[PDB]
Structure formats: structure tokens, C-alpha cells
Amino acid sequence: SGAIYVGNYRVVNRHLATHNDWANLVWEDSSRDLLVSSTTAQGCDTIARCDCQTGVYYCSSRRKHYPVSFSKPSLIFVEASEYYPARYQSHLMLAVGHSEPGDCGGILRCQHGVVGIVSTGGNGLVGFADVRDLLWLDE
Ligand SMILES: CSc1ccccc1CC(=O)N1C[C@H](C)C[C@H](C(N)=O)C1
Ligand SMILES: [Zn+2]
Incomplete structure (x- = not known):
């Protein structure tokens, strides 16, 4: 498990994404195994x-x-x-x-x-x- 938090984004492996990640979907690519979702808090x-x-x-x-x-x-x-x-x-x-x-x-x-x-x-x-x-x- 693990993610990248940059600005109002959370980057995770697409196969490990949550229901919250999919409900706040920005972009996903099955061929790259990536999914990016929106966050309210600023990223570290x-x-x-x-x-x-x-x-x-x-x-x-x-x-x-x-x-x-x-x-x-x-x-x-x-x-x-x-x-x-x-x-x-x-x-x-x-x-x-x-x-x-x-x-x-x-x-x-x-x-x-x-x-x-x-x-x-x-x-x-x-x-x-x-x-x-x-x-x-x-x-
Ligand atoms: C660090 S993953 C690993 C390491 C050693 C051995 C086996 C694995 C498992 C692995 O390579 N995959 C299974 C995962 C559910 C999806 C991955 C993908 N991006 O398509 C492929
Ligand atoms: Zn470098």
C-alpha cells in the first residue's frame, strides 16, 4: 500500500484504489496501473x-x-x-x-x-x- 499526495491530488496504484478514490476520480489508466483522485487537504x-x-x-x-x-x-x-x-x-x-x-x-x-x-x-x-x-x- 501507499500513495503520492501533491496539491489537491492523491496518486495510487489503480488495482488498490478505494470507493472514495473512484467517487472523486480525476484520471485513471489501466495500462499504467495508475489512478488519481481529488483531496480537500493540500499535498505533502x-x-x-x-x-x-x-x-x-x-x-x-x-x-x-x-x-x-x-x-x-x-x-x-x-x-x-x-x-x-x-x-x-x-x-x-x-x-x-x-x-x-x-x-x-x-x-x-x-x-x-x-x-x-x-x-x-x-x-x-x-x-x-x-x-x-x-x-x-x-x-
Ligand atoms: C511488487 S508486485 C510483485 C512483486 C513480486 C512478485 C509479484 C508481484 C505481483 C505483481 O507484479 N503484480 C500483481 C499485482 C496485483 C498487479 C501488478 C500489475 N501492475 O499488473 C502485477
Ligand atoms: Zn531526478
């Missing part, structure tokens, strides 16, 4: 606007932050679930690191701010849904 986080490929993510299954090198946002195949069929997920960045079902929502950050959130993983890998192209989150 800064979004990075960069092409960094190094950062630090939070891993709940270990209660630890880990430093990682990660790939550029791209189309990557992902397997079925109670939420999605076999498909390509766009804007996804992979890194060598630990992740298990439960780690989705953990934040990835570089020196410039919030880069994205944990969204996939498996066999010594971890995938992050990028948010750096969502320029509207700032305005």
Missing part, C-alpha cells in the same frame, strides 16, 4: 521532472529503503491477477531489488523528488510506474 510531496536512472525506494516487506539503478519508462509484459489479464504495462521502469506482493505503493525518489511508485516485481526485480510525465499534477 514534490514531483521530479528529470531523466534520472538512480534513486531510492521504500520496501514495506523489509521495512527498509534501498538504493537502485532503474531503466527508462517503457512497455513491459505482465501476468494475470485478480485485477488484470496478461498485457503490456506502459511507462514502467525495472530495477534489481527485492519486492513481494504487498510492496505496491512504495515511493521511488531521486535528488529531484518523487519519481514513481512500486507496481510490479518478481525474481530479484522490482517495477515502478513512472509519474514524471504527468505535468498537470503540478498545476
Whole structure:
């Protein structure tokens, strides 16, 4: 679990969104596993606007932050679930690191701010849904 709170927005994994998130829906993309909802309170986080490929993510299954090198946002195949069929997920960045079902929502950050959130993983890998192209989150 976990979310990004920036201004009057809450960014979460689409497969983990609540009834309140869907009732206050701003934008959602099943191909990116992202959903953004409106909030009344002001948000605590800064979004990075960069092409960094190094950062630090939070891993709940270990209660630890880990430093990682990660790939550029791209189309990557992902397997079925109670939420999605076999498909390509766009804007996804992979890194060598630990992740298990439960780690989705953990934040990835570089020196410039919030880069994205944990969204996939498996066999010594971890995938992050990028948010750096969502320029509207700032305005
Ligand atoms: C950190 S997630 C993870 C990690 C290790 C092993 C397995 C997983 C689970 C995982 O990759 N997915 C299941 C999730 C319900 C939806 C995800 C998606 N974005 O389509 C894919
Ligand atoms: Zn950066």
C-alpha cells in the first residue's frame, strides 16, 4: 500500500484504489496501473521532472529503503491477477531489488523528488510506474 499526495491530488496504484478514490476520480489508466483522485487537504510531496536512472525506494516487506539503478519508462509484459489479464504495462521502469506482493505503493525518489511508485516485481526485480510525465499534477 501507499500513495503520492501533491496539491489537491492523491496518486495510487489503480488495482488498490478505494470507493472514495473512484467517487472523486480525476484520471485513471489501466495500462499504467495508475489512478488519481481529488483531496480537500493540500499535498505533502514534490514531483521530479528529470531523466534520472538512480534513486531510492521504500520496501514495506523489509521495512527498509534501498538504493537502485532503474531503466527508462517503457512497455513491459505482465501476468494475470485478480485485477488484470496478461498485457503490456506502459511507462514502467525495472530495477534489481527485492519486492513481494504487498510492496505496491512504495515511493521511488531521486535528488529531484518523487519519481514513481512500486507496481510490479518478481525474481530479484522490482517495477515502478513512472509519474514524471504527468505535468498537470503540478498545476
Ligand atoms: C511488487 S508486485 C510483485 C512483486 C513480486 C512478485 C509479484 C508481484 C505481483 C505483481 O507484479 N503484480 C500483481 C499485482 C496485483 C498487479 C501488478 C500489475 N501492475 O499488473 C502485477
Ligand atoms: Zn531526478
